[PDB]
Amino acid sequence: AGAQDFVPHTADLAELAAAAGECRGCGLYRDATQAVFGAGGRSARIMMIGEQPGDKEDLAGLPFVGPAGRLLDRALEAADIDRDALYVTNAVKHFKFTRAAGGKRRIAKTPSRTEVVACRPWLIAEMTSVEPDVVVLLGATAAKALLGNDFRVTQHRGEVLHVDDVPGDPALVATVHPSSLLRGPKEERESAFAGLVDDLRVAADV
Ligand SMILES: O=c1cc[nH]c(=O)[nH]1
Ligand code: SF4
């Protein structure tokens, strides 16, 4: 059942966000500081979904406020997407992490399929409340939550997809995770940013 028993019968994002602070749907609530719900309004045409809040998001209470958020904003700007048209969230709402002695941060640990399924009720409540025209899936974790554990983003990036089992039959565009555009050689990171901007343009045009 996961988080399903904790999700209230309401589409109000403020009430949903408050209830998510009380969620015990998986074990991630324990070590995490707080729940990081999505940001934006129900008028949004474009929903974007990442994997999970990171270290800054965990303490800031908001999604994409770190370096990946900076690179996403750089790409949204290049695709002329207004953030007024955006509801932005993640597949899990609790930071899963570890600490490496001598590190400068708490390190994100990849969510399990069990944690992603436990938390999908919140993502369904968000899609039901926002009724997006298009869902942008940022990375493998977010894309598998809605397209299956077998889905490969590398093979389907920038394709307009539609699955019948998804609420509202919104179009789905899967793309690379913005954190991937931080690591690597200059011209690959640049090629990768250009691919992200194309994927955002496809979604803005849906
Ligand atoms: O997937 C991610 C990574 C960083 N911050 C988020 O909000 N989501
Ligand atoms: S990660 Fe999702 S399911 Fe698990 S406790 Fe947090 S809100 Fe509930």
Residue numbers in the entry: 2 to 207
Lines from the paper:
UdgX excises uracil from uracil-containing DNA to concurrently form a covalent bond with the resulting AP-DNA. Structurally, UdgX is highly similar to family-4 UDGs (F4-UDGs). However, UdgX is unique in possessing a flexible R-loop (105KRRIH109). Our earlier studies allowed us to propose a reaction mechanism of UdgX, which involves the formation of a covalent bond between H109 of UdgX with the C1′ position of the target deoxyribose sugar concurrently with the uracil excision from this site in DNA.
Substitutions of His109 in MsmUdgX with Ser, Gly, Ala, Gln, Cys and Lys showed the loss of its covalent complex formation with DNA but gained canonical UDG activities. However, H109 substitutions by Gln or Lys, showed poor activity. Both Cys and Ala mutations of H109 showed intermediate Kcat/Km values. However, to better understand the mechanism of uracil excision by the H109 mutants, we determined their structures along with a pentameric DNA, TTUTT by X-ray crystallography. The DNA backbone could not be modelled into the experimental electron density map in any of the mutant structures that were determined. Nonetheless, all structures revealed the excised uracil and the side chain substitutions at position 109. The structures also revealed invariant interactions of N91 and H178 with uracil. When we arranged the mutants in the order of increasing cavity sizes (left), we noted that the canonical UDG activity of the mutants increased with their increasing cavity sizes to begin with and then with a further increase in the cavity size, the UDG activity declined (right). It suggested that the initial increase in UDG activity (H109K to H109Q to H109G) occurred because of the efficiency with which the water molecule could be localized to make a nucleophilic attack on the C1′ position. However, a further increase in the cavity size (H109S to H109C to H109A) perhaps destabilizes the bound water, thereby decreasing the UDG activity.
